[PDB]
Amino acid sequence: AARDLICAQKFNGLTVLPPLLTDEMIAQYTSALLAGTITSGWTFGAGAALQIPFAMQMAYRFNGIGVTQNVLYENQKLIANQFNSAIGKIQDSLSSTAS
Amino acid sequence: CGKGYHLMSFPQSAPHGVVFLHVTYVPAQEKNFTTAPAICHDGKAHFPREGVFVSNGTHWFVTQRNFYEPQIITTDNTFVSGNCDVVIGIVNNTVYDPLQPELDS
Ligand SMILES: *[C@@H]1O[C@H](CO)[C@@H](O[C@@H]2O[C@H](CO)[C@@H](O)[C@H](O)[C@H]2NC(C)=O)[C@H](O)[C@H]1NC(C)=O
Numbered sequence: 561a562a563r564d565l566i567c568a569q570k571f572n573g574l575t576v577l578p579p580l581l582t583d584e585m586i587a588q589y590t591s592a593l594l595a596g597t598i599t600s601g602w603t604f605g606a607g608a609a610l611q612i613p614f615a616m617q618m619a620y621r622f623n624g625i626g627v628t629q630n631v632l633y634e635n636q637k638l639i640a641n642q643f644n645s646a647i648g649k650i651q652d653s654l655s656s657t658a659s
Numbered sequence: 660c661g662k663g664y665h666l667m668s669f670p671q672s673a674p675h676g677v678v679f680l681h682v683t684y685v686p687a688q689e690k691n692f693t694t695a696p697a698i699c700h701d702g703k704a705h706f707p708r709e710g711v712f713v714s715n716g717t718h719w720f721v722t723q724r725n726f727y728e729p730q731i732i733t734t735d736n737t738f739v740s741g742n743c744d745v746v747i748g749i750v751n752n753t754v755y756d757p758l759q760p761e762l763d764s
Pocket residue numbers: 715716717718
């Protein structure tokens with residue numbers, strides 16, 4: 561008895577097509593980008609995938625923003641703790657705020 | 660401006676359009692190496708100036724990131740910051756200094 565809007569839209573000649581790429585393939589693209597970024601920095605975006613430790617990759621980024629890499633190598637635990645707390649703040653904000 | 664490391668580009672005309680011939684640099688033949696963040700020497704931590712500490716099966720070298728040009732670890736291309744118990748993954752190796760063969764002469 562509860563007639564939907566979509567049934568009337570289909571019965572009046574309007575049709576919604578499905579997208580070509582499914583959400584599983586979009587998530588696999590996202591997973592490939594994350595795995596490449598984490599395990600190779602930016603080199604996978606400029607040719608072959610070149611492995612590097614993540615602390616040395618972060619030291620390369622720190623030299624990129626104009627800070628000497630000893631600042632990273634003497635504060636690695638504090639930087640990792642700040643990153644973990646920031647990720648927890650993002651997931652709590654996305655759990656709470658819906659706007 | 661193309662895929663890779665950009666060097667130049669060349670414009671060309673086209674009917675209702677333009678065509679760019681982007682010139683790019685692409686790394687080709689990678690090789691595996693054993694790396695470390697810092698070098699411990701005489702209770703001092705040596706970090707590379709602009710490069711990476713790599714190693715073959717026996718020795719240690721410092722080289723640039725985008726090409727394999729190994730060189731001897733020297734105080735000219737390294738800087739000192741603190742001591743050896745603050746860096747995770749530090750390895751013991753000697754550091755050459757240029758003044759010592761001039762002194763022992
Ligand atoms: C690793 O690097 C070292 C760098 O010293 C190489 O040792 C040299 O090998 C050549 C042979 O091609 C000798 O002529 C030199 O006298 C060696 N140097 C020293 C200080 O002994 C070594 O061959 C490289 N490879 C391996 C597998 O250890």
